[PDB]
C-alpha cells in the first residue's frame, strides 16, 4: 500500500495581510513538495532529492494550481464568515486533506478528500467518491452547490486517474528510498525511580515508514494500562523514533519483554533488560 496525500491550510490574519496559504505534499510518510504563499517568490518546491529530476514545466504547473487554490481558500474563509455570522476581526482556519491510496494491484484502493473550518469537519467526499457528507448545516449549502455542479464526479476522475498515475510516477522517481523499509534498531534502558520501582524504556529508532507497534508484555498479557506511549516523532532525516515506558518493581524486570514489529522486520522483535 502506497499513498499520495496533500495537506492544505489557509490562515486568516486580520490587519496583517492576505490569509497565508500553505500546501505540503506527501508520498507515504515522506514530505516531497511544499508551497508557501508567504515565501518571497511563491513556488511549489521539491523537499526531497528524488524530485529534483522533474522539469520546470512540472513545477510551474503546480505553482499555478497552488496560486489559484490559495485564492479560493481565501474566498472560502470569507464565505465562512457569512455562514457563521463571524466578524472580520478574528483569525480563522480552513484546511483540506485529500489523496489516493493504492493497493497491491497498483490501482486505487481509497480516495479521500475532506475539508475543515477552524479545526472541525466541514465537508468530505464519501468513500464511494459519488457523494458528500456535510458536517453541519452551513456545509449543507456547500453540498447543494457541489452536487449541482457535479463536483463529486470530476473529483472522482482526479483521484482515480491523475492522483494514482502521479503517485506511481513519484514512487518510480524515488524508488531507491521509498520502497525499502528501514527496520527499527531497538533497545531497552533502565531508570530507577526508587528502591522499589524502576522505569524500563523501550526504544525504537531510525525506522521507516511511520507505522510501528511497541507493546510491553508481562508473560502473555500486555500492559497497556500503566505504560507511557509517546507519539511517534520524526528523526529529522526522514526516519522516525518512538518509545514505550513501563514502571515495574525492582527484581521483576526480567519478567517483562518489549515486543517491537515494523514492516521492515521479518519477524517481531523481542527485547529485555538483562
Amino acid at each position: 500500500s502506497h499513498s499520495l496525500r496533500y495537506f492544505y491550510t489557509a490562515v486568516s490574519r486580520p490587519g496583517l495581510g492576505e490569509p497565508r496559504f500553505i500546501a505540503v505534499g506527501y508520498v507515504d510518510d515522506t514530505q516531497f513538495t511544499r508551497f508557501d504563499s508567504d515565501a518571497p517568490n511563491p513556488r511549489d518546491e521539491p523537499r526531497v532529492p528524488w524530485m529534483e529530476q522533474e522539469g520546470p514545466e512540472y513545477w510551474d504547473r503546480n505553482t499555478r494550481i497552488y496560486k489559484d487554490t490559495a485564492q479560493i481558500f481565501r474566498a472560502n474563509l470569507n464565505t465562512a464568515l457569512g455562514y457563521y455570522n463571524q466578524s472580520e476581526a478574528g483569525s480563522h482556519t480552513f484546511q483540506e486533506m485529500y489523496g489516493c491510496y493504492v493497493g497491491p494491484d497498483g490501482r486505487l484502493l481509497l480516495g479521500f478528500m475532506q475539508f475543515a473550518y477552524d479545526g472541525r469537519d466541514y465537508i468530505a467526499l464519501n468513500e464511494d467518491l459519488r457523494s458528500w457528507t456535510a458536517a453541519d448545516t452551513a456545509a449543507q449549502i456547500t453540498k447543494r452547490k457541489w452536487e449541482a455542479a457535479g463536483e463529486a464526479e470530476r473529483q472522482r476522475n482526479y483521484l482515480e486517474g491523475r492522483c494514482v498515475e502521479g503517485l506511481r510516477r513519484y514512487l518510480e522517481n524515488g524508488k531507491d528510498t521509498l520502497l525499502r523499509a528501514d527496520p527499527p534498531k531497538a533497545h531497552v534502558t533502565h531508570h530507577p525511580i526508587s528502591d522499589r520501582e524502576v522505569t524500563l524504556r523501550c526504544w525504537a529508532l531510525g525506522f521507516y515508514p511511520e507505522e510501528i507497534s511497541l507493546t510491553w508484555q508481562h508473560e502473555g498479557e500486555d500492559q497497556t494500562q500503566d505504560m507511557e506511549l509517546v507519539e511517534t516523532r520524526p528523526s529529522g532525516d526522514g526516519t522516525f523514533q518512538k518509545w514505550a515506558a513501563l514502571v515495574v518493581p525492582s527484581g521483576e524486570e526480567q519478567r517483562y519483554t518489549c515486543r517491537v514489529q515494523h514492516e521492515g522486520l521479518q519477524e517481531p522483535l523481542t527485547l529485555r533488560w538483562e
Binding site: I65, I72, T142, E151, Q155
Partner: peptide, 9 residues
C-alpha cells in the same frame, strides 16, 4: 500533481 483545488464552499 495536485488537484485543481477550485472548490468554493
Amino acid at each position: 500533481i495536485p488537484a485543481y483545488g477550485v472548490l468554493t464552499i
